[PDB]
Amino acid sequence: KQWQKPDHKNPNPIAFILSSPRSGSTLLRVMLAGHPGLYSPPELHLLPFETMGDRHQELGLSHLGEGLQRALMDLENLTPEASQAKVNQWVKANTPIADIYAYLQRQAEQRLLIDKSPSYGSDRHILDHSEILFDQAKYIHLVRHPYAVIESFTRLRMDNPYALAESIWRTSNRNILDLGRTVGADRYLQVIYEDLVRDPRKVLTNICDFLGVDFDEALLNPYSGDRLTDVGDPNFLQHKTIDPALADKWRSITLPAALQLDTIQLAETFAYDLP
Numbered sequence: 488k489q490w491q492k493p494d495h496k497n498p499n500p501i502a503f504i505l506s507s508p509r510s511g512s513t514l515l516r517v518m519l520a521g522h523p524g525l526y527s528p529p530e531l532h533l534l535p536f537e538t539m540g541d542r543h544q545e546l547g548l549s550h551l552g553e554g555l556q557r558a559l560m561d562l563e564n565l566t567p568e569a570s571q572a573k574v575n576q577w578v579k580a581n582t583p584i585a586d587i588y589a590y591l592q593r594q595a596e597q598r599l600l601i602d603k604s605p606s607y608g609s610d611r612h613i614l615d616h617s618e619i620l621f622d623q624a625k626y627i628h629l630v631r632h633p634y635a636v637i638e639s640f641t642r643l644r645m646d647n648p649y650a651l652a653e654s655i656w657r658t659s660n661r662n663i664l665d666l667g668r669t670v671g672a673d674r675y676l677q678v679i680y681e682d683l684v685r686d687p688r689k690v691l692t693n694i695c696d697f698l699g700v701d702f703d704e705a706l707l708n709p710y711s712g713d714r715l716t717d718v719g720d721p722n723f724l725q726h727k728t729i730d731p732a733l734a735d736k737w738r739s740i741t742l743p744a745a746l747q748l749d750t751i752q753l754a755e756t757f758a759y760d761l762p
């Protein structure tokens with residue numbers, strides 16, 4: 488299904504946090520929400536759709552995409568009912584997704600809008616929509632150890648569930664890597680979850696340099712103030728700090744069978760060790 492090419496591409500900066508699910512993407516986006524020069528809301532889920540009509544047809548009842556309501560409430564001092572009504576009106580008007588991004592960029596004012604998604608990378612065609620819509624999109628590719636993702640995906644009953652979890656990690660990571668190769672290092676940055684949790688100050692400083700903002704201490708305190716956490720990780724609020732022990736989860740795990748040959752090659756590209 489071909490993407491509608493806008494009359495004029497969006498020249499305004501935007502950034503995405505792309506990863507496989509269960510990779511610390513909620514932690515990273517919540518860390519980023521503390522920065523005063525960035526706007527990092529819960530999952531907008533806009534990129535896979537052409538218009539708000541397609542989005543409504545595909546999503547429907549599902550709670551996925553409710554982050555757009557939360558964003559609007561926060562950006563405009565709206566109630567849930569008033570937020571939903573703004574969404575319902577866009578739906579009725581079959582409002583192009585290109586317009587929703589330009590709207591949020593406007594409502595974010597000077598702040599750099601960050602669209603975090605653990606599912607956009609599952610389909611190369613979804614990722615292709617960004618290069619069609621934007622001139623200056625930046626991509627943060629957050630990567631986690633395949634064993635840690637598989638174990639976590641298994642536990643959460645997100646679904647052989649082990650083969651599907653491996654497939655999703657591999658598919659996403661390969662698609663995001665391929666996107667990164669097409670755009671410059673100027674518009675793509677790999678972030679290793681294991682490095683983020685062991686030294687968040689060093690990693691978040693690199694992310695800030697990439698996004699063109701200064702480092703702010705609030706980045707290190709995801710559990711303080713309103714960061715719009717009230718989808719994403721359902722267990723997120725079960726932690727007190729940036730937990731470095733969660734990185735070493737891949738060490739106490741033995742999967743029912745060996746990883747596939749291309750899953751191994753891809754994991755080696757990110758310097759991971761596989762026993």
Ligand SMILES: Nc1ncnc2c1ncn2[C@@H]1O[C@H](COP(=O)(O)O)[C@@H](OP(=O)(O)O)[C@H]1O
Nearest residue numbers: 509510511512513639720722726728729730733
């Ligand atoms: N405060 C924190 N510190 C370190 N890691 C965290 C964290 N909060 C969540 N995570 C990691 O992020 C994972 C979820 O990633 P995503 O947000 O992309 O779904 C969690 O999976 P588990 O709760 O299964 O361990 C957890 O390992």
